[PDB]
UniProtKB/Swiss-Prot annotation, chains A, B, C, D, E, F, G:
Its cofactor is Fe(2+). Its EC number is 1.13.11.39. It catalyses: biphenyl-2,3-diol + O2 = 2-hydroxy-6-oxo-6-phenylhexa-2,4-dienoate + H(+). Belongs to the extradiol ring-cleavage dioxygenase family. InterPro entries: DiOHbiphenyl_dOase, Glyas_Bleomycin-R_OHBP_Dase, Glyas_Fos-R_dOase_dom, VOC, Xdiol_ring_cleave_dOase_1/2. Residues 4-118, 142-263 form the VOC domain. This is Biphenyl-2,3-diol 1,2-dioxygenase. Homooctamer. The enzyme is composed of two planar tetramers rotated at 45 degrees relative to each other, with a channel in the middle. PROSITE patterns: EXTRADIOL_DIOXYGENAS, VOC. Shows a preference for catechols with groups immediately adjacent to the hydroxyl substituents. Keywords: Aromatic hydrocarbons catabolism, Dioxygenase, Iron, Metal-binding, Oxidoreductase, Repeat.
Length: 287, 287, 287, 287, 287, 287, 287
């Protein structure tokens, strides 16, 4: 069973711009360059985000974490019984990712996904942010979340819930005009309100945004000014209706957006699915 | 499995009187008028109480909430296997209620019931009470509770526990005279002491009372004076023996009573069924 | 300096009625009969209330407590410098009261007052209430409070604040009719909102009421029913605007009223004098 | 499944002595006399201990509480499948005990036992102790515990654990002389360290002692002096090695001993069975 | 101003008996032998109790601690202005006591007293008790307390309060027979209820007892059994009425008694002097 | 199911050196000598470590604790179904160990192991350390842990996880030179990060080290100096990367090392297996 | 009145070595270079440590902080009345230091001192350490402390306590050989155990060491390894006897030592002066 989103890899046209953006604007820690690409940290793990040179300028792969080898076996079996082509990652790939074991496959629309266990910790190299950030929230909630854009939401939903095991948190009916309303589905695999969201948005990218959560309001406020100085803000500070995250959105060098937030609520055992007609309580003014 | 009482609808002869009573006396928030009727809020949900014009001057329907679509499927199946006529609510009905999916049916004595999932939240329209009330207690405990009057308690008990899944909290042997003692059964489906009570009381209404729970003693004290000013109090402040609710009772424009309370105790895992010979520890003097 | 109200003595026409009222209705503990009269306890002190046979059917004397012999000396000196006739209580009187040292005198309108130190504790005879009461609130807040009726409030104010050292908490402008408004002054000598209140009310008694504070709402609720059973309630449950005490009032066998309350707020160092136009926030309906 | 020890009944030769001992020495509340005998309370339940006139001067019956009717059915079935003669208590018996339903049977050595559900609460008649006692500890831990003397411990163990479902907490090897060592087995059915203990002690009674637990050390200290005044102490204050109860033992009018304690530790999920060679850490000097 | 009782010295006929009693029964730590005598510790200080060979078999001297050199100067001045013969301790004496500076003098009845500042700490030699004791309570409350027997209490009171600055906590009227009642005065110089008590008891020793306070009830319970094994208990476990200390008394090899207690209450700013007619709430049965 | 490591026995050439090392350096409590050997305590259990005269100068046996007799039966069955030679410990062996029941067998490489239930508690003989130690951490976490050296880690892993039920916490890839990297596997059977670790280290002993955990940093700091005084430190203070234990290592008289630590983190339900490339975050400099 | 040590300035021969040492080893934040020198931060203040090129390779000046202009006036007056040459810092100096007002003078042995008020905060430039450090402890405790070496301790004591107002915390008698014992005096001006210590040590520098306090043990552990890598450790980890600081000492490029610690205890109102014979409880082994 998937425990959380563990890592993400981006294939971008401008690696230097990405390096500067991640460290100086967002405050991630530069963790070296390997055959896995330029590595970035936000906690004790050896890396959480990898940046590789590539033409797509988008999310290249995402890795979901299971607790152990048994968990990996379960998932591989579940994917096979569903008719999904699964490849047992070879030692070389496992080494490049710094994991113990992994399997690779793709979602129904071509996004390369990896399920792994036994990632590397580096407590001996204490995390030091690239900018003043009190801390990032990971732990049992994993890396954060991202919104996957798809041409068919029902097909995507069936795969992510029936095959991968994600559970529905809630739905937001996004009014994208008078004649268009698109439901966005938010899914969880742990306490974090959502680790994955699915929506049929007509975007030129695989994901609408990825999100990183910080420890204090000031972390968000200071980062906003750093990003705003370069004219990269896409949405002012606001609070979402479903996860209650206080955040702003900004544009990365690839056009893909990043959400930088604080104070999201978690999903508990008494949680019930609900629907919303608005994505934000206040703020989040498009700029 | 039913998680809580989610909403209630009343069919009344005087809609204006009801509007004024709910907002000015009890402090509910007016939420607009739709084809679902005049809507009222007590929390983040789009509505909890609907008031429609009707001749019965009584509870018209009650909606029980399940966590998701799977839960809805389970219940529909459970009702069918029991020989109950269930109707899958059509899109039009689902839209009128503001829910994702629902099924309709009736209890053994004709009360229309609905089981649904995916109700609408409106965090973007923050709750503002119609009178000074610090807050209402809902959350995982749902809307509150109501006492269903029935001609046959054993038949009612079998349906609500065996088919709907409610669990018995306790029983109060109501001495309604020298020659008459009527047992009132209190049932729970979550932490709230009781979401439903059943009793063979000879009343001209479907329910003896419905209850709303507030956050502080002052909320109750202030409301008492507001209601008392119009001579609508039916029972002075007191505390019940079973749920330990401190409350007063008042008459709504339909004759049906409302209980407005505070500080009820909850049901835990070590709870055991007990019996009582009195409904109140102190107070609750009939007026 | 006066630390609190320590004890009170009543001279009544019906001692048996008083005994029954104090123990069975209010829950005080019967502490024996001495030359000091029938004694009653509410805590570790040997007695707090004394009931003696007398014709006035009213408060006979009140004792204010100082911390020690130095404190007693200070007060005696303060009274003398003000021209008040002070009598050093003789050993016989000290023994009757169970105190170490005391001085006696009267307020400007004839109420016998005593200031003492070194009262008797009886921890070896644990307090057991005469009725189900979880506990009374005394400690550093003393016995409770009483409202002294006077013909001239300014003369009374000068004596109690300038000579006895009480400090003003607040004032309530009591509208006793279209042509009459009487200010009630509330004074403190410790954390308790008021230990003494002064008002020019046209009553046939020395005090309007005396108050006892209990530990829980249920103590008040149960006592209300006990008193109500005998038709002795004079004012329904309510909460005062100034001390925020939730209480009811009842008639003692002498006609003097008793207030039985819970949850009063205390006076702190940042307290500021304010005025009110109403004595109650809610409730306290005269009956 | 048994949730706790709910009530006990004693058949004694001197009912008046028992009444005085329970109320004045131990502080129980006299709850009236019915066809069930003289009733005594220690909490919200209508009664916990019944005293009836009888020749045995010993424990006459004990009632174990289950959560509901389903629980009662389970136990009846379990006893039947074990070949135990079970009698469904008739309405008359249920009424005498003040319970909803019950079954009666006996342990392998003749002690009448009852398993019931739905006992009566009397919150409207607040508990008032017969002596100064801050409170008794019951709740989910039930009444307390008793040590059953038996001629064959293994036969007794098989019945109480295999049939009744009690779980072993620990064992104390009681050295009753050079040539005699008797193991005492302590069993639990809830958090209370033990609700029942079994030992092959050569006593003329069915039980060695029954125990009541109070809320504070002073409750124990004051009670000790009350009992000691009549020369009824059998064991000085001490603390047990297994349940860590601080207690003293005294003789009841029937010769059966009562343990009055405070501060016992509870059994949790990580509990493991252990053995002891001494019953007390300190104190408990036989007198 | 005196901050606390810092150390005590005993002059005894049997030093070995004292060594064994203090370490094995009471659990003090043996700290070596110097020209100051056999030294014993209960905390971080180099020593708190000194045992020297002597004929009196009694308290030889007591040392009161001031905060600093200024405090020492104040006290010396206060004693001189009172006509008391004060001697500035010489370097040799200061070295023997392990203090920075000290003055010596005697109370009105010949007890040698010392006031000092700058005692020695030995954090580098962590405290290890001679018997199983979780810890002793010292800190700002100092060593503990002792009751000084005197032929004239008023003369003793004047010296200790007017000259030494101790403040009265309370008084206990000790009935030592039909024709004799002796008041015991309890005095404090910090939070500890009393550091010194004065009473005109006809004892052959300078003090009735000295007290040591431990951290848990078990410390007291275990020590009781250790002492009881040698038949040295003089008073069973009990709780005092004034300081609320739960303790037992035992005889030291010199006949002087020691009180070993736990859970005493402290004196605060709102403390008021009171009187008691009994020294104990419960227990403390003379043996 | 195994609940924890309960006891360990060492067979050494110099029993006196071991006695002195354990009590004076580490602070264990000497618990007597029996046919089980010299016994040592760290908590309420009768013994945790046994030292016997022997030629191996190494760990002689280790005992794993199960909750009860059922647990013992389960394990015996599990071992038998795996083809392991199990011997039901005879009464004589059970008596020597002070346990209720036990089974004996060996791990794949000859280490004698015992699984037992019902060990002996000695609350009546309160723990008193041999040196100043505030306390040892045991409870549900058991004795501590040890690292088992093996010639084949996969064979060892299969036995300890598949047969004994231990679960993997994490792995550390120990670089023991340019051409050698050895994975160390850390396993848990309760909250303690690891109760057992397995590694193919080329050591002349059965275990690399055993660990004892204390309650405070000072316990570790003081012990370090005691051990350092004799030149027995093998590794300076440091903190491990996986269990986060702050500790130092020292050499026992047998050459086997002991780790003395504080502040280790525990394993929870959301734990996931990870890998590390370093065994320490800081410190732990080999000396 | 002096509130704390606010800033320090060093005049060194190798500014680059100092820059690298402070940021990379200790983790201070580089704050730019001004006419005040290379500036370093540890909190919200614009700078706490200044490094200037100079020949002394020692502490060049220290600044003590007062609360306001009135405080500055008081101190200037106090110094003048003592005959100390005080210079009112000119606007140019105030600007260079970034303060509102300041006075300059020297201690009896030539150390330039400054007393100022109104230093500059830079909350808009959030603190980011030069190495992984969770945080430094400053606030009301100021920068930290330093030990001033002097030829005459009594002369130094008189100036710092009588003129500057520092209060004595404690004294440590430093045995610097058989024939030499030197008392070190520790003084406080706020909660920090000591802000200044004075000792007649024969060192070639003005101060023995300066200390910086961090927020966690790991901060100390990681820094130790960073410093140890360059062979700069002078004293291993240990805990002091007086302030209870857990720290290590290292050599700065100027030879002056720096103490880097954690978990020091504070001085309260009930503090009393004591003496010690050892500077450390454990550790602090000279290397
Ligand atoms: Fe879920
Ligand atoms: Fe998002
Ligand atoms: Fe339930
Ligand atoms: Fe209700
Ligand atoms: Fe005031
Ligand atoms: Fe009042
Ligand atoms: Fe259990
Ligand atoms: Fe017992
Ligand atoms: Fe005082
Ligand atoms: Fe005492
Ligand atoms: Fe696990
Ligand atoms: Fe280890
Ligand atoms: Fe100070
Ligand atoms: Fe220092």
């Amino acid at each position: 069973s998937i425990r959380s989103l563990g890592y993400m890899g981006f294939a971008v046209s401008d690696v230097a711009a990405w390096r500067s953006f991640l460290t100086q604007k967002l405050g991630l820690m530069e963790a070296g360059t390997t055959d896995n690409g330029d590595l970035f940290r936000i906690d004790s793990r050896a890396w959480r985000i990898a940046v590789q040179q590539g033409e797509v300028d988008d999310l290249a792969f995402a890795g979901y974490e299971v607790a152990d080898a048994a968990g990996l076996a379960q998932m591989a079996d579940k994917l096979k019984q569903a008719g999904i082509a699964v490849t047992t990652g070879d030692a070389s790939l496992a080494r490049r990712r710094g994991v113990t074991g992994l399997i690779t496959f793709a979602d129904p629309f071509g996004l390369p996904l990896e399920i792994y266990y036994g990632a590397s910790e580096v407590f001996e190299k204490p995390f030091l942010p690239g900018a003043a950030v009190s801390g990032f929230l990971t732990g049992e909630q994993g890396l954060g979340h991202f919104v996957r854009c798809v041409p068919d939401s029902d097909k995507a939903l069936a795969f992510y819930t029936d095959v991968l095991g994600f559970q529905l948190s809630d739905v937001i009916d996004m009014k994208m005009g008078p004649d268009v309303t698109v439901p966005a589905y938010f899914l969880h695999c742990n306490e974090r309100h959502h680790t994955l969201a699915i929506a049929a948005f007509p975007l030129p990218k695989r994901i609408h945004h990825f999100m990183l959560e910080v420890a204090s309001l000031d972390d968000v406020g200071f980062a906003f000014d750093r990003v705003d100085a370069d004219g990269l803000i896409t949405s002012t500070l606001g609070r979402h209706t479903n996860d209650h995250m206080v955040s702003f959105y900004a544009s990365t060098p690839s056009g893909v957006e990043v959400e930088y937030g604080w104070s999201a609520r978690t999903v508990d055992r008494s949680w019930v699915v609900v629907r919303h007609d608005s994505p934000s309580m206040w703020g989040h003014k498009s700029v």
